[PDB]
């Protein structure tokens, strides 16, 4: 319903619709793991070496595992990313990197976490007011208001540095912040055009299941068919540079028309806060992204290849004690996303 002569004050930083989206995604994520097989039985000492290749991202590890009978044992070996494994005996002895902190649960292989868009709808007695102001900056009076019972479908995409499957700005790149001037706050950038990004896990993998108990299965990486190559993402180079030019033109509105803007890479810390990450094909990718933020913009076909790392034990919501284990994905993964925006500081 377009509301003729109706204006209202909006504040995206105090929007409890966001708070619910956050709260609910976490609750469903956890609910989905309740019926799945636990991997706490895998907190064992592992003997480990490197995976054969010519000259070590992947580890070749083995251990004494339980079987369907409690009094029997089997020798099990599998392939692991080194990022999920820690050396303890300073073959060398290793343990899974999360055994001193959390329970690890295997996600059921039959359950998809694809960010299928959903609509949020108001209950009786309530209504959702919305802006049609294409220049609205996420705060303050909104000159053109209409109302709905339900929002547009929103994909619950989980990411860090880049936003890969959201909406585009209607006209111009929009830059929004709680303050802009406050260095303690984030600046969110919404592109008015998509940037194509092509990500892959260029390794043909196999998977095997291990019966570790009564209907209790563990999914292990079998081996790699063909070459072993690093995961990576391809970003259109020309598009990216044009995109940054637009971002800079808009950023300058708050910094000065002749102010020089520089894009630098991230600060140090855990991969979850220093790299770009996403879940695609069932794998959790961590991308270096420094190739995207390495330029200075001064007033007056090709691609960028970003190496990526992959992990299987994920502390999904930055909580301690609840770790999810991503079972191996067979075959080769190819993902194409729309960069729709950035989170910058």
């Amino acid at each position, epitope marked *: 319903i377009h509301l003729e002569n109706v204006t209202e004050e909006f504040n995206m930083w105090k929007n409890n619709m966001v708070e619910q989206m956050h709260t609910d995604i976490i609750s469903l994520w956890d609910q989905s793991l309740k019926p799945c097989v636990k991997l706490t039985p895998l907190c064992v000492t592992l003997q480990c070496t490197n995976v054969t290749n*010519n000259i070590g991202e992947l580890k070749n590890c083995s251990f004494n595992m339980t079987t369907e009978l409690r009094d029997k044992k089997q020798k099990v070996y599998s392939l692991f990313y080194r990022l999920d494994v820690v050396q303890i005996n300073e073959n060398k002895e290793y343990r899974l990197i999360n055994c001193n902190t959390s329970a690890i649960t295997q996600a059921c292989p039959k359950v998809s976490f694809e960010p299928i868009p959903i609509h949020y709808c108001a209950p009786a007695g309530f209504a959702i007011l919305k802006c049609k102001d294409k220049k609205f900056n996420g705060t303050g009076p909104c000159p053109s208001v209409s109302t709905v019972q339900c929002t547009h479908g929103i994909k619950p995409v989980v990411s860090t540095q880049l936003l890969l499957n959201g909406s585009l700005a209607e006209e111009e790149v929009m830059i929004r912040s709680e303050n802009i001037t406050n260095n303690a706050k984030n600046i969110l950038v919404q592109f008015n055009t998509p940037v194509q990004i092509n990500c892959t896990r*260029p390794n043909n993998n196999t998977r095997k299941s291990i019966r570790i108990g009564p209907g209790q299965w563990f999914y292990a990486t079998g081996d790699i068919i*063909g*070459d072993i*190559r690093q995961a*990576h993402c391809n970003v259109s180079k020309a598009t990216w540079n044009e995109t940054l030019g637009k971002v800079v033109k808009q950023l300058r509105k708050h910094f000065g028309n002749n102010t020089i803007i520089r894009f630098a890479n991230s600060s140090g810390g855990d991969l979850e806060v220093t790299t770009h990450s996403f879940n695609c094909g069932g794998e959790f990718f961590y991308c270096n992204t420094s190739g995207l933020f390495n330029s200075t913009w001064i007033s007056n076909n090709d691609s960028i290849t970003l190496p990526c790392r992959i992990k299987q034990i994920i502390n999904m919501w930055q909580r301690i004690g609840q770790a999810m284990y991503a079972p191996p994905i067979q075959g080769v993964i190819r993902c194409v996303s729309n960069i729709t925006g950035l989170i910058l500081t």
Partner: antibody
Amino acid sequence: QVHLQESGPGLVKPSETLSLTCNVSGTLVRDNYWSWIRQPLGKQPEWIGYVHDSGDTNYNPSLKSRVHLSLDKSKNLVSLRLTGVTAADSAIYYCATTKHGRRIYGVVAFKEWFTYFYMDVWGKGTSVTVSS
Amino acid sequence: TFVSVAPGQTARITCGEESLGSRSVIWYQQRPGQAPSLIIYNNNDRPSGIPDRFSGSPGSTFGTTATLTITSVEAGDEADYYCHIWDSRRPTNWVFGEGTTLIVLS
């Protein structure tokens, strides 16, 4: 046509240093990559190593501590020096001109490729044994 | 290891272990008393002077050994066929793989 002429005594004492020479003609030894190969009787050939310039040399790891290769551009000769010779080193030794190619399997920028070698020009070989 | 081929028949020569990764096979034919002579490099590249009857298997496969097909075998092709193999998932081979004698039954 490049002519590779392997030469040596054909017999070296046990616990002795062996030195073979390949007389290169029709090309400059410094421009080509050179390699040595040997073939013990009844066996398939073994690479010994390769030599060229700018540190771009390599050796069979079993002979790495025993073999030293050198190219003398002023004589246009390829030298092969093998120490510690024993009965196991009896073989026909060959001089060959090696070419280097490349095979790419991955991203390139991540060095997901390798160089491969093949030998286009071969000499006749020199049969060298080890004996009192 | 040998293959018995009547003149005009096709030789089927194999060499080496199964590929793990991308491979580059170099084949040489050594006539008795001669230095090995290159016939195929990079799986199927034949240097000038080498007949088209010599055709190698691709290096795109995995789980396979090197294979050389020699069609229309002539008495002059009698030789020991050896291969040297480069594989992205294995350490450098400083030696040749055991070859196959091609015996022409003329």
